Amino acid sequence: GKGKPRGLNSARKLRVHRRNNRWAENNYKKRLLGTAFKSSPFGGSSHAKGIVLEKLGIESKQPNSAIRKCVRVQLIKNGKKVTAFVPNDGCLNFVDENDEVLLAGFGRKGKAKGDIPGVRFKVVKVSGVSLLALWKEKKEKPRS
Amino acid sequence: TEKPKKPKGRAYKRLLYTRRFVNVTLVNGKRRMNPGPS
Amino acid sequence: SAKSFILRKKELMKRRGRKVAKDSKFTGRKRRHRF
Amino acid sequence: PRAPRTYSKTYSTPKRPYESSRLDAELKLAGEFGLKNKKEIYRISFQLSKIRRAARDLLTRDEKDPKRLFEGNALIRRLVRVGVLSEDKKKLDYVLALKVEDFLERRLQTQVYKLGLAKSVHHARVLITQRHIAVGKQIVNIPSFMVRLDSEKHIDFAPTSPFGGARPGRVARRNAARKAEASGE
RNA sequence: GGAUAGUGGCCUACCAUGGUUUCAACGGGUAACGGGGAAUAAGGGUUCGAUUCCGGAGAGGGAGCCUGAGAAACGGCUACCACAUCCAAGGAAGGCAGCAGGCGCGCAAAUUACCCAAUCCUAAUUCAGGGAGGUAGUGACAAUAAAUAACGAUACAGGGUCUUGUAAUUGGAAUGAGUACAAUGUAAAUACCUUAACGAGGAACAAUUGGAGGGCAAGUCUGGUGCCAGCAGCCGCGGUAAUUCCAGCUCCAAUAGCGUAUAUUAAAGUUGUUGCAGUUAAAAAGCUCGUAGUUGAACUUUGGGCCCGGUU
RNA sequence: GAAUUUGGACAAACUUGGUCAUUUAGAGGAACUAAAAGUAGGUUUCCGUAGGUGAACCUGCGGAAGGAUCAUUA
């Protein structure tokens, strides 16, 4: 019983049935179709670099608000445009227009985390220095 | 403010042993690890 | 609504019979500041 | 194109890192033996797990198997020569019964404290690091030397190291010079 | 028959119509060089392998050829294509995926250094040459060992005449991080090993990285800012979908390391051969016939006696 | 024995028309997004098919319960 063939000379049907069922995965189909190299905002890369096109005044609510903003950036290698949650407040004065920021993911192996709908990137670096050192008044942003 | 510096490395672990169980300092009966104003 | 969510889910483990740390003025705040 | 140099790491962090019983037992061990961090405990646990895995898959082997006899006798001889396993416990189910602090007892730091000469474990570690203890005639400045059974009567003060004679150290020298130029004339 | 070093449709003339395929031929894709191997630890598996060894292929893309035992060679030649250098404008000269190094592309990677002293290789050859190789410079890829303190005395506090802690109290010890005669080291040096001399009293010679409802170890902390048709009246209180708006204190973990992102493995019995599930949660073809495939009742010399010698 | 020459095999590349592969403009369309702020009703639930309709919806035929078995004889 138990559905599957069980005979001793019956490895071929087990092989082909396993291959079709594995094509009904989620990770296997995303990996063997080359989905990240053609369709992902990154090229399957851990980090990326981009040009800050716009910054929008996105608050959580209206005037009694939480200052949690994001910028809209265009990639260097792909040319695609994404959006990125900048770190803790006070970093918005560092990120101006056309700053060559470096971006990573947000923490869900390729999905958005947090209460911001549709943002899965964070600005790791700005102008090629940092945000942690730049916010902690350790290093300062170079001019132009 | 400035304080006398905390020991570093092995002695610090030694300090925790002295802090945790030789002559146990602060207990509420259920071994609290961070008290405030009692 | 972070504080309200923590207070709402905070009462369930009392119903389910598990220990819960007693509440004070540190609940709905950024305990560790971001980058 | 030089032939590769093989390396390997000798410790393994625990799978579940935040549990109270293991943390308090580790702090107990670190306090009683005077350890710098948890990596010494991890190192002993790693090599004890290696020993236990070898003992397990030798005990699974059938009795009078020549591989079982050879590897088991070598393992028991090595762990008696180190001094962890006792003289009356030369079996395989008994080497499966070994514990971490049994290994941690045979360190040079614990052995130089237990043989007098140090009056504390942290004083023993500081005394070893400052190049004061010689095994035989070789000065050892390592707390984890893992003293054998045949050299237990040879841990002594160095031919250097002013606690064993031979030209007292820098601070006493400066104090003697100070007393000679000030209180001398 | 020709050609080859040689078998061979390898090619040519003649003659047959054959050869492979559901046990997947052929075609397409491969962000595919293959293997020894690597990570993941109950097993079986899953993922990776451009890269220290073995084999293949290429020298910007093709093609052709000389010399030679060996090449369809590119630090050899010839032609075309694409790039591109010098000028006297007539002509000439190219090929770093060798070692350094420059631009470019990027999240992503070091010196235009010294030497044949080692390992070996080439030659007419113990002698010459070797960016092969070795040495040093950069280097927190990864891996190993463990400094940042130890011992007293005083005054109190305890378990209570012996054992621990506290403190703007005090005392002498000890040593390397460094600065370096010298000597070892080395082709010559740098460094390690050894060592004359100097080198610790705390803002010295000062350890960081993360986190604290629960996950998960660690707060019945403090201050400030902003709003309220809520009380008071200029003191203030409370609330604040301010998803805490901003700082500090205290505590926990790991520790010369720690955090984050991406991928993968385990937990995962969410790929299930071991080992899933299908009435109602995803899922039994509307039903039957039927080829390949998978599977397929029982039975044929058993039993008894003889000796010898092996292992506990 | 050089310059040059006939034929052959090897064959780079060029011109014409065709095949395939990826990317950028292009009227129009259908969907959706936060858009704080625009124009009381009937109520069995479905499945297949056909027609009609601003919106679900209405109607015809066949099937299902994934719909609440009282009472009495024997």
Q: Could you tell me the residue ranges of all domains in chain B? A: 1-38
Residue D20 phi, psi (nearest 5): -75, -40
Name the protein residue, with chain letter, whose CA is nearest the C1' of E158.
Answer: B23
Residues contacting residue D76 through CB under 8 Å, at least 6 positions apart: D85, D90, D91, D92, D95
CA of residue A99 to C1' of nucleotide F73, angstroms: 95
Long-range contacts of D89-93 (CB under 8 A, 24+ apart): D92/D55, D92/D58, D92/D59, D93/D59
Determination technique for this entry: cryo-EM
Long-range contacts of D59-64 (CB under 8 A, 24+ apart): D59/D92, D59/D93, D59/D96
Of A2, D34, D181, which is closest to residue B17 (Cα–Cα)? Answer: D34
Structure tokens at D29: 């061990």
**Nucleotide at minimal C1' distance from the A14 CA:** E273
Tell me how close the Cα of A82 comes to any Cα of chain C, in angstroms.
21
Residues contacting residue D126 through CB under 8 Å, at least 6 positions apart: none
- CB spacing of D36 vs B13 below 8 angstroms: yes
Map residue B11 onto helix, strand or coil. Answer: helix
Please give the residue of chain B at the shortest CA–CA distance from D36: B10
**CA D4, CA C22: separation in Å to the nearest integer?**
58
* Chain D environment of B16 (Cβ under 8 Å): 27, 31
Map residue D155 onto helix, strand or coil. Answer: strand
Angle at which helix D121-129 crosses helix B10-20, to 10 degrees, equals 180
Q: Strand A101-105 and strand A48-56: pairing?
A: antiparallel
Of A95, A89, A74, which is closest to residue A141 (Cα–Cα)? Answer: A95
Structure tokens at A74: 């265009």
Q: What is the DSSP track for D17-85?
A: ---HHHHHHHHHHHHHHT-SSSHHHHHHHHHHHHHHHHHHHHHSSPTT-HHHHHHHHHHHHHHHHHTSS
Nucleotides of E under 7 A from a protein CB: 23, 31, 41, 47-48, 52-53, 105-108, 132-134, 142-152, 158, 164-166, 172-176, 195, 198-200, 202-203, 206-207, 210-214, 216-222, 226-227, 240-248, 250-256, 260-265, 271-274, 276-278, 284, 293-296
Burial pattern A87-103, b for ≥16 Cβ within 10 A else e, equals: beeebeebbeeebebbb
Residues contacting residue D79 through CB under 8 Å, at least 6 positions apart: D51, D85, D95, D98
**Nucleotide at minimal C1' distance from the B36 CA:** E221
Which residues does a gap of C–N over 2.5 Å follow in chain B? none
Amino acid at site A18? R
Residue with the two structure tokens 């063997």: A32
Structure tokens at D46: 């790693």
**CA D47, CA D24: separation in Å to the nearest integer?**
21
Amino acid at site D137? K
Cβ atoms of A41 and A75 closer than 8 Å = yes
Q: Please tell me what DSSP assigns to residue D92.
A: H
Residue with the two structure tokens 């610090």: B12
Cβ atoms of D80 and D102 closer than 8 Å = no
**CA A113, CA A109: separation in Å to the nearest integer?**
10
A69 Cβ under 8 Å from any chain C Cβ: no
Tell me how close the Cα of D11 comes to any Cα of chain B, in angstroms.
19
In terms of Cβ atoms closer than 10 Å to its own Cβ (0-12, 13-18, 19+), residue D83 is buried
Sheet strands side by side (includes D138-140): D138-140, D133-135, D155-157
CA A39-A41-A44 angle, 5° bins:
80
Q: What is the DSSP track for chain A?
A: --SS---TT-HHHHHHHHHHHHHT-SHHHHHHTTHHHHTSSSSS-S-EEEEEEEEE---SSSSS-----EEEEEESSS--EEEEE--STT-TTT--SS--EEEEE-SSSSS--SSSTT--EEEEEBTTTBSHHHHTTSS-PPP-
Which residues does a gap of C–N over 2.5 Å follow in chain C? none
Map residue D135 onto helix, strand or coil. Answer: strand
**CA A120, CA A106: separation in Å to the nearest integer?**
5
Q: Which residues lie across from A104 on neighbouring strands?
A: A122
Residues contacting residue B26 through CB under 8 Å, at least 6 positions apart: B32, B35
Cβ atoms of D38 and D82 closer than 8 Å = no
Cβ atoms of D30 and D38 closer than 8 Å = yes
* Chain B environment of D34 (Cβ under 8 Å): 10, 14
**CA D10, CA D49: separation in Å to the nearest integer?**
11
Of A101, A139, A98, A106, which is closest to residue A123 (Cα–Cα)? Answer: A101
**CA D74, CA D65: separation in Å to the nearest integer?**
14
CA of residue A38 to C1' of nucleotide F38, angstroms: 43
- CB spacing of B14 vs D27 below 8 angstroms: no
**CA D97, CA D29: separation in Å to the nearest integer?**
18
Structure tokens at C6: 């923590």
Rounded to a whole number, what is the distance in angstroms from the first to the last CA of chain D?
Answer: 70
Q: Which residues lie across from A72 on neighbouring strands?
A: A54, A83
Q: How far is CA A30 from the centre of its chain?
A: 16
Residues of B (1-38) whose Cβ lies below 8 Å from D = 9-11, 13-14, 16-18, 20-21
**CA A35, CA D156: separation in Å to the nearest integer?**
68
Of A80, A84, A85, A83, which is closest to residue A39 (Cα–Cα)? Answer: A80
Domain boundaries, chain D: 17-185
**CA B29, CA B25: separation in Å to the nearest integer?**
12
The H or E element containing residue D157 is strand D155-157
- CB spacing of D31 vs B9 below 8 angstroms: no
Map residue D122 onto helix, strand or coil. Answer: helix
Rounded to a whole number, what is the distance in angstroms from the first to the last CA of chain A?
Answer: 73
Provide the 10 A C-beta neighbour count for residue D29: 19
Amino acid at site D9? K
**CA A18, CA A25: separation in Å to the nearest integer?**
11
Residue with the two structure tokens 């002594």: D156
CA of residue C5 to C1' of nucleotide E86, angstroms: 79
Residue A123 phi, psi (nearest 5): -80, 100
User: Which chains lie within 8 Å of chain A at 3 or more CB pairs, if any?
Assistant: C
Cβ atoms of A70 and A84 closer than 8 Å = yes
